[PDB]
């Protein structure tokens, strides 16, 4: 029934523009989430590890693709390494589980999920007695390199990265030795957070945008009443009321006009429905310099506060 446009990666690659999030999305409702989303012609899944509900997000696609419902080829699925796992064998290992879970032979997009290494061990979320991040021995360096191979055998189409800035972005492509350029950088983008000069340097060097959180992730455990709301916002609803569409159709179609893929989560089936129900109108020019001139450099997700270990990506500007 829909088609989300492609963006072309450096690659050649096709990436469909919106595809489903699923952090999140609890365990015994994301299958279904995806099957909606799958039948509806979404195309593009976004999952991680860390989400711990890979296995289901694999069911749903499985079945799917038993079903002739769609095409592994034409299945665009993203996964992501957790800073755990940065050590070689780890990036392996982590990778291993990933796809097993997912039920795949291979995946689209395989991404460093965020730049700075965390201890190594069974802990996702390692601390000290005061709560704040351990860091660990290998870096995102270390993992690309890990990472590199997957490509080379078969086993991952193209490598991205999360949560970078430029400078980060700069070592990478800048490394001796590099095989592989990273596709994408998958980043929190809305209007609260509009991100110009990390959209701006990515596309210069040919690298696409992500936009993760795009509806403010309303669903963030950490949410505080006084946090900005982008789905109440009024000055959003009055312009989706002048297209006849949600706040939400709005939120998402902002990416889609700046060419930036974005990932909105439901596991809501009307939802999930209408938040692919976005190429049937455009924002007008002015109402984009309007949605824009929202930015507040506000970031929903921040509960890493690991400003101490090194590579912590939000110090740099962009
Ligand atoms: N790379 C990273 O570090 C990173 C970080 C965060 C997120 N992500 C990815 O980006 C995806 C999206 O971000 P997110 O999960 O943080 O939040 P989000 O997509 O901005 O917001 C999700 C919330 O919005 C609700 N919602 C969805 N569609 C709606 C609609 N049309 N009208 C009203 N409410 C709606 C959902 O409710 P229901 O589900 O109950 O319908 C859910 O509570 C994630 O799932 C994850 O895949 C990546
Ligand atoms: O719960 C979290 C982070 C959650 C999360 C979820 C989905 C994402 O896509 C993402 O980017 C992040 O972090 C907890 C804090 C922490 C983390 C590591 C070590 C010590 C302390």
Same mark, same amino acid.
């Given at each position: ?60 696609i499985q079945?799917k693709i038993?079903?002739?419902?769609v095409k592994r080829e034409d299945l665009?699925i ?26 795949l032979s291979y995946?689209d ?147 889609? !006009? ?18 692919? !129900? ?41």
């Amino acid at each position: 029934s829909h088609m989300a446009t492609f963006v072309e990666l450096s690659t050649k690659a096709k990436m469909p523009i919106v595809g489903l999030g699923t952090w999140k999305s609890p365990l015994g409702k994301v299958k279904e989430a995806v099957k909606v989303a799958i039948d509806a012609g979404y195309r593009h899944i976004d999952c991680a590890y860390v989400y711990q509900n890979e296995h289901e997000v694999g069911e749903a696609i499985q079945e799917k693709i038993q079903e002739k419902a769609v095409k592994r080829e034409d299945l665009f699925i993203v996964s992501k390494l957790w800073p755990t796992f940065f050590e070689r064998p780890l990036v392996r290992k982590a990778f291993e589980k990933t796809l097993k879970d997912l039920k795949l032979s291979y995946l689209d997009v395989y991404l460093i999920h965020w730049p700075q290494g965390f201890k190594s061990g069974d802990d996702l979320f390692p601390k000290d007695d005061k709560g704040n991040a351990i860091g660990g021995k290998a870096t995102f360096l270390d993992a690309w390199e890990a990472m590199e191979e997957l490509v080379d055998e078969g086993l991952v189409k193209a490598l991205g990265v999360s949560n970078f800035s430029h400078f980060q972005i700069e070592k990478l492509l800048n490394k001796p030795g590099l095989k592989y350029k990273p596709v994408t950088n998958q980043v929190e983008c809305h209007p609260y957070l509009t991100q110009e000069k990390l959209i701006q340097y990515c596309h210069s060097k040919g690298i696409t945008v992500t936009a993760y959180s795009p509806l403010g992730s309303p669903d963030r455990p950490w949410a505080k009443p006084e946090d900005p709301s982008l789905l109440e916002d009024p000055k959003i609803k009055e312009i989706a009321a002048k297209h006849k569409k949600t706040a939400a159709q709005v939120l998402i179609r902002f990416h889609i !006009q700046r060419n930036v893929i974005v990932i909105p989560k439901s596991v809501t089936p009307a939802r999930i429905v209408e938040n692919i !129900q976005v190429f049937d109108f455009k924002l007008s020019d002015e109402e984009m310099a309007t949605i824009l001139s929202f930015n507040r450099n506000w970031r929903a997700c921040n509960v890493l506060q690991s400003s101490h270990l090194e590579d912590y990506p939000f110090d740099a500007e962009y």
